[model samples]
Target: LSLVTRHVAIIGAGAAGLVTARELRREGHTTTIFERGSSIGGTWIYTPDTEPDPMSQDSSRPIVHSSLYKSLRTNLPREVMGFLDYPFVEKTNGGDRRRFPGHEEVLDYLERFGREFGVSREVGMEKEVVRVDMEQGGKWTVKWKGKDGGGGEEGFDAVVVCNGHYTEPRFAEIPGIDVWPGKQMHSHNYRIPEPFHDQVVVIIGSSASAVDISRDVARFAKEVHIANRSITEGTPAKQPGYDNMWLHSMIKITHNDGSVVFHDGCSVHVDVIMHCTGYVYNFPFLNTNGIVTVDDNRVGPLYKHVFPPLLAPSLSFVGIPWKIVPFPLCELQSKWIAAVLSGRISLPTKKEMMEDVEAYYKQMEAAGIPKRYTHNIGHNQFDYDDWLANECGYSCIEEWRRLMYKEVSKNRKERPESYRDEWDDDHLVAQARETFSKF
Candidate 1:
């Protein structure tokens, strides 16, 4: 392998794209980020302005792309949810109390990061990548539409598709769904419970998003019905001080029979259906003829979940997995991809990549988990510290644990003397214990 200068094009300017761009730049690669929206922070900008959407309660608005939803927040703790250089869980002003910043805070943080790291200079805002064609010269011709709706094309040595998966919603093909629907909408478009007020709402799926939306709607709706193929009961009790503990305890899933269930076992007829089910990855721009493979609805191509086996020598996809701190993973993936492209690293072959993804998905499927719920299911559980360490090539779990403890310790040490009085060590310990016990 030899060092070489490469031009890499990244699609999307969300957390994944921003982090990837920063990592690539750090590795001395000429990188350009293509964002379909005018600003960055995809899915974090357009929060709901009304009740029922969690983000509506936030006091400040953060910089975000036009597509961001109001209900979005950093699901994982800031300590693990942030970029490599930027820490999301900084000491709160005049206090030792750790605050889980809202969606607005995260959006603002990402914006500041882009500015601080000079990521904005490499980003092309409002540039929608329409199509990408691989040339015989071993480069990619990317056609994109400008913010003004004008079309143009550019060539890149390689392309990294970082568009987050939640932009498009997946719908179930239930019988008579098209005709029986009174007011059916996926969670992707759900902003508030105003429309559901005085009406019974049926939410499908049992993921965190489903649980959160159902709870919010239950406050205003006449009744809330949650439908799940199987009831799943798992919540992080380790961080009881976090908001999720309170939020999760408030919601309940009651299985009535095979296909029907009531919230908290309360009988209620549903009028509206909110499908907080999940999403599927669709790469319309790229010609995945020989580059990618899918089995049982799971897609894969590379060793580190970035490089495609068939296209391993060139292309990669960052931030495409389920249930992990996407920011750090994207950064790490970008660095690894840059290394591979620059001939500083070697990658697994197509056969090896296929086998890896196949084995992973098989294990997940064998566990009786729905493939659609790929984010939370499978080997990629929502343990940010574990994911960060694994993706960044940490030697062992003990090393990662030490790093996380050090981060927490540093945060504790940075507290002001006066604020130490409000530390509430007993409460923190109790909360941690309570949260962990739920597991």
Candidate 2:
């Protein structure tokens, strides 16, 4: 393969987009990044305001793009969250240095990264992409409108989608939900726990947001009952260190009496039912003409969750996978896509890539994994990172990162109450410190 410079259009100015822009420029490609927000930081950007529609089920309600809540901190430590090339160390200039800093600290880190790598200059701030379509001769036509209502269209050799998910809330399907008299809201609108004060709140789902929000709400709410789908059949277990918080089995139904019945037969007269059930994958501006589909939350027919079989190198996505070390994984994905755009890495044929995706789907079905978790890399992300790195002729993810991630995860599992503040990975940290010192 010979080297060739290509113009790439990247959507969003978040971690994924910033890194992709830098990686593309490193490969000698001209890049343009479109960010809908006035500034960058993507999901890390926070606002106390929320949409008027609590559940965000109403199509007319203006959508609030961020899902961050006040008092939220990174669940994963910074040691493993940094890009392989960029060390997320204590900023000597300014910012939080805690092992698990707050969301604002992360935004600071991202802003610094963008400034340092010259990514900030490439961003078209407040440009909301309205349409991205494949044009004749394999180029991409990207159309966007600015915050000031100024709009334009441009052509690019390729388009890279880096828009972070977690904007659109996925509500749980509940029977007789329409008649329930209790207030209903999704975690997306949750800004602070003060609103939950004096209310009997029932939070759905058992993921990070559920746990964090439940804990946060418990401090002020009259009672906080957490419903987990994986809960065993029994009475709700009282959460430690909190008298008003309890963990219950999944909710079975909601009655008109403002009562919520659990699978374990426990019932409570709830005032608010908060859905911490996560978000859906949405690409509102993309137009693939039925080639790319998001079914049951599975964004698919893509090879390795990045390139669509038909689109291949021309259209790609980053940060699609979840439940992994995000930044480093995004870096690896960015490097692979950048190399492909540079004509230094060749991809499998469309047919072959489609076959591979089919095989993967079959494997997931055989394992009884839900389609909604198609991109839930979890423990498998390390291999995926290494795979992308090898495909792009780059070194594998560092061993220290994997080990540190595992150790931190173990700590989180064992000490859920203090995992973020407590850890037992000094050796791993020392190793990372040595490696990052060279950078």
Candidate 3:
């Protein structure tokens, strides 16, 4: 199991792929990363100009999925959103009550991380992985096409699929959705609010994306309706100084009896419906028939959503979980995989892995989170700070607090004009305070 000379092929050069490359190299494994787009950042690289379409003024820019919208920011703070070794925000500018970071800043941070970690060299841009075949010799041969449409093949002892789950948008089939006379699109195709100006808009789904976008569009739209099947858990209180508190309040579910329920209820209607529903994990390249089992939306045969039982000791999936940021998770998972491959670490037996996966799913089901959502691994149940500590092998909460303190100090020194503005009653701030109190 010596990997000193064994080559690894990493698919997708987004945040996960870049971090994986860096981690694998540190473990002494030769690695190559294949990226479909010309640049990195995966969904973040593309900034669309239209509302529900990826059509942009800059043809040179990548065509991103529509659900990827503007005015977007990470729900987690910069320190928590960063890589294992690199903090997205400088410790000096770290905290200061500004928990969520804008999309553009995150993109810049990721780009800098890639360069700083030397991942730029091993990444092949504009290369789309079309197929990955398991050769009889027990090696993986990856077939890909270049931007020019020419095909090429490469071989590797093992493969780590890091394509991510955000690219594909899931559209729930509403009986008359296609027949609706007004404009319609999934959140995936939405970029900005200009197209939605003066229009009546309906946004579906109750996740962060749906809530954020609905708020933004409502500012300019004649009317914005939110048609949600169910509302997930939401922050109940307000932060001391933020203004976006209303956005975090329990989502009200309107019923026929003049009763208005929130977060705990279901269903509604709107003008231009934007489905921020969610996404599914799709690896058409991998043959799931014998290697994995998919129940409804949950794909399995893996433990901790990383090592597939049927493919144990050789394959792993990095950046597949939610709650924690993907970069650090990718880094740690890559290291573990590299160690296992190099004989420095022993993986669980196939039966053990299977049992672990089953137990994990059972717990999730009992908690009421569906298997389909878990398959994509995008639900946030674990606290961000705790999840980071578990996945990165280091406590990010301290770093986050230190950053927050620094920001407060700097702001006091600067004494900016807007310093007196009272904090908004936002859900995130309340959640943060609650989390901080526990610490």
Best by lDDT, which number? 2
Cα lDDT of model 2 by residue, 266-333, tens digit: 78899999999989999999999999999988996789999999998999999999898788888889
Q: Report every candidate's CA lDDT.
A: 0.60, 0.89, 0.62
- lDDT per residue for candidate 1 within 1-439, as digits (tens), equals 3578789899999888988888777667897789988789886776553233322223353322233344444334455555655655453463223344557777777888889889977789889898988889779888999867697988999999888776545665443354453555667667666767777666776455565566567657765655654543442121222221111122232222222223334443346756666766767677766567544445664455566666775678887777555666666667677776777666666788768767866776898977654444223333433454454463222333234434433443343112223433343444433433332
The alpha-carbon deviation from the true structure for residue 28 of candidate 3, after best TM-score superposition, in angstroms, is: 0.2
For the record, the alpha-carbon RMSD of candidate 1 to the native fold, in angstroms, is 9.1
| TM-scores for every predicted model | 0.73, 0.97, 0.74
| lDDT value for model 2 | 0.89
Return the top candidate by TM-score: 2
Residue-level lDDT tens digits of model 3 in 183-282: 5566767767787777756566655456567667766776555555553345332223233222222335333333323353423334465567666666
157, model 2: CA deviation in Å? 0.8
Off by over 4 Å in 2: none
Q: Which regions in candidate 3 have their CA more than 4 angstroms from the true location? A: 1-5, 49-67, 91-99, 173-179, 231-270, 293-295, 365-369, 375-439
Worst 10 residues of 3 by lDDT: 416-425
Candidates 1 and 3 compared: the better one by TM-score is: 3
TM-score, predicted candidate 1 vs. hidden true structure: 0.73
